[PDB]
Amino acid sequence: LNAKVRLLREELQLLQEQGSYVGEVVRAMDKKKVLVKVHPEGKFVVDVDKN
Amino acid sequence: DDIQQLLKKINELTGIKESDTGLLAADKQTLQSEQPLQVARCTKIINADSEDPKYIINVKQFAKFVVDLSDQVAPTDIEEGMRVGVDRNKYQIHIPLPPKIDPTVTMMQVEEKPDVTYSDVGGCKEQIEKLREVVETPLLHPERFVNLGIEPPKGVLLFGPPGTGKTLCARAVANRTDACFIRVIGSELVQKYVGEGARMVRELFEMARTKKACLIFFDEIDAIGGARFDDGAGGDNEVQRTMLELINQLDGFDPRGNIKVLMATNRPDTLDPALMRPGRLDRKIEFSLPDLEGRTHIFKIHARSMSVERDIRFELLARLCPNSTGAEIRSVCTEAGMFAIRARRKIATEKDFLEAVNKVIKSYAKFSATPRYMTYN
Amino acid sequence: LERIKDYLLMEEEFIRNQEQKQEEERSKVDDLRGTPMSVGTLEEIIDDNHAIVSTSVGSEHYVSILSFVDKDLLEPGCSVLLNHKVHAVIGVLMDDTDPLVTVMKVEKAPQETYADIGGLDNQIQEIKESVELPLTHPEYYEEMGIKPPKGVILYGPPGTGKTLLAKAVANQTSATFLRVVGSELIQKYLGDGPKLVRELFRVAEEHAPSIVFIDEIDAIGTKRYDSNSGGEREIQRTMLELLNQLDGFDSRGDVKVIMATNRIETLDPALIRPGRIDRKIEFPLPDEKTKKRIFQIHTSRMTLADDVTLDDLIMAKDDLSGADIKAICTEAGLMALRERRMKVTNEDFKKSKENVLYKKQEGTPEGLYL
Amino acid sequence: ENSEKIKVNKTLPYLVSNVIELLDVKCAVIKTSTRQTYFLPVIGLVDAEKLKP
Ligand SMILES: Nc1ncnc2c1ncn2[C@@H]1O[C@H](COP(=O)(O)OP(=O)(O)OP(=O)(O)O)[C@@H](O)[C@H]1O
């Protein structure tokens, strides 16, 4: 039981990782490429994740 | 349901086919050298200093940067008031930059020639003559004006009822101008940033000044803020600044110099008084509804292409059109052919046009064209 | 229960749409291209291959181009794609139109051909000669010497189904159909909205034969009245750009415009002129013969009792629109379902007309007077 | 100090721009061309009297 609570804190090491930007997809193209505009910047072609 | 099944079976067959189907030296050595090659962001020089030059440059939004010249450059080649490229890492002017072309202004220039002769425009000899000596003769033969010591108007405003032919004449001038013709996109001049459009208008004149003798066609002048209510709300404040910038560059403190301005408006009354004032636009060539000789000529030019019996009387057809714009006369010719196509007769006859004359004018809700009143005979 | 086959066809079609590299050359380009690539405008072209590229950050550094497929496509105003870090032009310029323009294009038309419409046959003839006929048989127009009419306006009282003719054109058109409301140009930013009108037309030219529908044109262009209070609509600038696109220098290429207005008098004269609307189509409220065809079409796919008299409803009441006929047919079916009869009696149709027409009150004392 | 001063003026982050105001505890507030305002506890290498708001 003590291991579980400390493991939850070990899981909290995840909070350290930086958040990914939030953007809107203008359109999609083939070969795992999508055209997404960044919220305060400009159009970015991005590589899609396996998931 | 069986027929629906056949389509569903066809879709299933396509699904089986898709699943079954599933079951230059530039990209070589050059890339290895290219990735190390550094970038040089563009910036504009404003000044120079004695001894170490210490040229100070505004990047374009960043800051005034006191950057020394790069080691592999000639100090004379770097110049004050010259665009330059500064490497961010080395903070020095590695290579000077050529002056900005500003392509959007370059795009508005016609470049191509519209293929319309003055002959196609018809029923407005006087309007054509007025345009000829503000557009073609002063540029082609300036000597005659000099002999009387008379300056050309250097400005023209074409106004009239819609469909009269104002733009058609303008494209005809573009065909034989023999000088740069600069059609202006009215929407382009309005811009999201405050006074960004006003900057473009300065560029428009600067481009005009660089070329020798050019005519600028501000069609739809109303789009270019051609009014100056300038109310307290100042919703049009950005456009009003753009309009004033055009007015000052047009005339005052040295005007066009070699630029002739042609402006065409369906509604002349809306145009702002300062633009209407002459000097900015000396000539006021208003196009007018064509007279019976003009109405016959517009019918003849429009119908020359169409195949028709040789006995048709355009004079009767023009008379039947009491007050018709050139576009409506063109509409009668096209409509007359469409009736012949409906009856499948290759060669049209006078009757077809009369049916069209009723259709183009009387059938439209003019009311005056269609008579139910005995009143007058 | 043949519905299951139809539902399967729809699901299968979606699956088909869902189911719609070189050993060394592609891998080298994949290495050359950055994982993130930022697309930016091309400002200047230089022969050395290092060409100035404008960006949102405005870094215009001359950047080398190494495009395996082709690097000769570079043009001023092209949107080049650059590496996030190196900023070199990665390759062939990205070629996608603005998102708002993409929404207008329509690939599927729900309605079928002119068969659903009844009694607008003269109106159908005009739309066909201007839109369907020139494409199907181009030779006839050339032999006549006529250039096909390119613009049409459909003006009628509410519920005369002007839109239905447009939906029918979409069903049988080779041309790509862009369906844009006239009220879809409300861009708040100064500018942009007139530019959007330019964008719709440039796409139409790119798609070659195209039909443009602008329903409720009254909002985009009406009167061209002066600023007055000084609010300045800027809508007049938007209408002027549309007026420029239809016939304002240059040419319209092969793009046809269909526009629909409940009220045509309000529309400014310049927009409604030959050269922008060569052919004008008027939808009148249906008379008697037109009403008979519409009443039959609406009741064709429903249970009909022998007792029902379609002619009696049409002759007894005059003023009902084509849409009103459809509403009477839907209401009559609901009236029967209240009595739990799937079959529809004559009595149901008589009750239905009364319920649908309760908001239409017209006329004053103009009876004894004349 | 002179060698550092020469390097800093030459460097890209020099951002030469006008002082919004002059302050005393001998202090300055500068709005850079980047439009960012910074208060410096020490007015700088150049004389405080020499500097003009
Ligand atoms: N006098 C004419 N001679 C020949 N064609 C004419 C004449 N007047 C009008 N047209 C026809 O009308 C169209 C020309 O219209 P134009 O380009 O001049 O714009 P406009 O309608 O006068 O301008 P605006 O919309 O600003 O009032 C073409 O179809 C052209 O053939």
Q: Whose CA is nearest to atom 27 of ligand 1?
A: B162
The string over A10-30, giving b where at least 16 C-beta atoms fall within 10 Å of a residue's C-beta and e elsewhere, is eeeeeeeeeeeeebeeeeeee
3-state secondary structure of C83: strand
Q: Are C16 and C24 in contact (CB under 8 A)?
A: no
Return d(Cα C304, Cα C173) in angstroms, integer. Answer: 34
Cβ contact C236–B239 (<8 Å): no
The residue type of A2 is N
The DSSP code for B60 is: S
User: Among the atoms of ligand 1, which is closest to the Cα of residue C243?
Assistant: 25
Whether A25 has its CB under 8 Å from any CB of chain C: the answer is: no
Would you tell me the crossing angle of helices B125-135 and B166-176 to the nearest 10 degrees? 40
Contacts of D11 (CB under 8 A, 6+ apart): B91
Distances in whole angstroms, Cα of residue D53 to Cα of each of B64, C52, D20, D35, D49: 18, 39, 6, 17, 10
Compute the half-sphere exposure of residue C238: CA atoms within 13 Å on the CB side of its CA: 26
Which token pair is C192? 């942009």
Facing residue for C36 by CB, picked from A27, A31, A44: A44
Cross-chain residue pair C94–A46, CB shorter than 8 Å: no
> Which residues in chain C touch residue A35, judged by CB atoms under 8 angstroms apart?
39, 94, 96
Q: Which residue of C lies nearest to B162 if distances are taken between CA atoms?
A: C270
Q: What would the two tokens of residue C185 be?
A: 């140009």
CA-based diameter of chain C, in Å? 94
Which residue in C77, C227, C39, C263 sits closest to C154, CA to CA?
C263
Pick from C29, C79, C31: nearest CA to C53 = C79
CA dist., res. B357 & res. C120, Å (int): 23
- CB-based contacts of B48: which residues, under 8 Å, 6+ apart? B55, B80
Tell me C67's DSSP state: -
Provide the CA D19 distance to its chain's centre, in angstroms: 7
Nearest alpha carbon to residue B276 among B202, B222, B206, B240: B222
Tokens representing B77 are 């080649």
User: Could you tell me how many CB contacts below 8 A there are between chain B and chain C?
Assistant: 213
Best of B43, B60, B177, B190 to substitute, by most chain C Cβ atoms within 10 angstroms, is: B190
Sheet holding C210-215, edge to edge: C105-106, C176-179, C210-215, C255-261, C151-155, C279-282
Q: Would you give the DSSP letter of residue C148?
A: P
Q: Is C365 annotated as a binding residue?
A: no
CA-nearest residue to B83 within chain C is C60
DSSP state of C357: T
- Distance of alpha carbon B146 from alpha carbon B38, whole angstroms: 58
Please check whether residue C246 is in contact with residue C257, taking contact to mean a CB–CB distance below 8 angstroms: yes
CB-nearest to C96 from A31, A35, A44 is A35
Angle between helices B350-357 and B326-342 (to 10 degrees): 120
Q: Does ligand 1 have an atom closer than 6 angstroms to the CB of B331?
A: no
Q: Taking CA atoms, what residue in B is nearest to C226?
A: B270
Give me the DSSP letters along B213-232: SEEEEEESGGGTT------T
Does any ligand 1 atom lie closer than 6 A to the CB of residue B239? no
Residues contacting residue B321 through CB under 8 Å, at least 6 positions apart? B295, B328, B329, B332, B357, B361
Q: Does B92 touch chain D (CB under 8 A)?
A: yes
C231 annotated to bind ligand: no
Task: Report residue A20 as tokens.
Answer: 């990914």
What are the φ and ψ backbone dihedral angles of B57, each rounded to 5 degrees? -125, 135
Of D6, D10, D12, the CB nearest to B88: D12
C45 touches chain B (CB under 8 A): no
Dihedral in degrees, nearest 10, Cα atoms C292, C295, C299, C301: 80
C-beta of B124 in contact with ligand 1 (< 6 A): yes
Strand partners, A28: A34
Residue of D nearest to B68 (CA): D10
What residues in B contact D14, CB-CB < 8 Å?
63, 65-66
| C309/chain B closest Cα distance in angstroms | 32
Nearest-atom index, ligand 1, CA of B170: 18
Measure in Å the smallest separation between the Cα of B95 and chain C Cα atoms: 10
Structure tokens, B323: 């007050």
Is any ligand 1 atom within 6 A of the Cβ of residue C274?
no
Q: Measured between CB atoms, which of B52, B64, B88 is closest to D16?
A: B64
Taking the C-alpha atoms of residue B358 and residue C241, their distance in angstroms, rounded to an integer, is 32
Select from D2, D12, D15 the residue whose CB has the most chain B CBs within 10 Å, as the one to mutate to test that interface: D12
**Residues near B177 by beta carbon (within 8 Å), at least 6 away in sequence:** B135, B136, B139, B215
In the β-sheet with D37-40, what is the strand arrangement from edge to edge? D19-23, D27-31, D37-40
Residues contributing to the annotated binding site of B for ATP: 160-167
The neighbouring-strand residues paired with C58 are none
C-alpha dist (Å) from residue B266 to B136, B158, B220, C345: 24, 9, 8, 60
Q: Could you tell me the sign of the dihedral formed by the alpha carbons of C199, C203, C209, C213, in that order?
A: negative
Per the listing, tokens 């002048």 go with: B221
Indicate the residue of C52, C143, C240 with minimum beta-carbon distance to B223: C240
**Which phi and psi (to 5°) does residue C176 adopt?**
-65, 135
- Beta carbons of D17 and B64 less than 8 Å apart: yes
Instruction: Find all residues with CB under 8 Å of C55, minimum gap 6, and list them.
Output: A42, C38, C40, C41, C82, C87
Query: Judging by beta carbons within 10 Å of its beta carbon (0-12, 13-18, 19+), is residue B13 exposed, middle or buried?
Result: exposed
CB contact under 8 A, D12 and B58: no
Contacts of C36 (CB under 8 A, 6+ apart): A44, A45, A46, C84
**Rounded CA separation B54/B1 (Å):** 86
Distance CA(B157)–CA(B278), nearest Å, equals 10
Task: Say yes or no: C21 contacts chain B, CB-CB below 8 A.
Answer: no
Sort out which chain B residues have CB atoms less than 8 A from D34's CB and list them. Answer: 62-63
CB B38 within 8 A of CB C36: no
- Give which of B262, B36, B304 is closest to B153, Cα–Cα: B262
- Nearest atom in ligand 1 to B219's CA: 26
Rounded to whole angstroms, the Cα distance separating C240 from C225 reads 13
Q: Determine contact, residues C330/C349, Cβ cutoff 8 Å.
A: no
CA distance B325 to B160: 10
User: Which distant-in-sequence residues (6+ apart) come within 8 Å of B169 by Cβ?
Assistant: B118, B121, B124, B127, B128, B131, B158, B287
Mutation target for D interface from B42, B46, B64, B93: give the one with most D CBs within 10 A: B64
The residue written with tokens 């019996």 in the block is B309
Amino acid at C25: E
Q: Does B54 touch chain D (CB under 8 A)?
A: yes
Test D15 with B65 for CB contact under 8 angstroms.
yes
- The experimental technique used to determine this model is cryo-EM
Q: Which residue has 């997404």 as its token pair?
A: A36
Q: What gap in Å lies between CA C33 and CA B102, rounded to an integer?
A: 29
**How deeply is B41 buried, as exposed, middle or buried, from its count of CB atoms within 10 A (0-12, 13-18, 19+)?**
buried
Residues in chain C: 370
Give, for ligand 1, the residue of B222, B263, B299, B330 to mutate: max count of ligand atoms closer than 8 Å to Cβ: B330
- Residues C152, C277: contact at Cβ < 8 Å? yes
CA nearest ligand 1 atom 20, residue: B163
CB B330 less than 6 A from any atom of ligand 1:
yes
DSSP codes of every residue in C15-56: HHHHT---TTHHHHHHHHS-SSEEEEEB----TTS-EEB--S
Does ligand 1 have an atom closer than 6 angstroms to the CB of B123?
Answer: yes
Of A26, A41, A45, Cβ closest to residue C37? A45
C238 assigned to a ligand binding site: no
Residue in chain C lying closest to B306 (CA):
C145
Chain D interface test: which of B91, B92, B94 (most D C-beta within 10 Å): B91
Probe target for ligand 1 pocket from B164, B168, B325, with the most ligand atoms within 8 Å of CB: B168
Alpha-carbon span B91 to B43, nearest angstrom: 12
B46 in reach of chain D (CB within 8 A) = no
Q: Helices C346-356 and C322-338, interaxial angle, to 10°?
A: 120
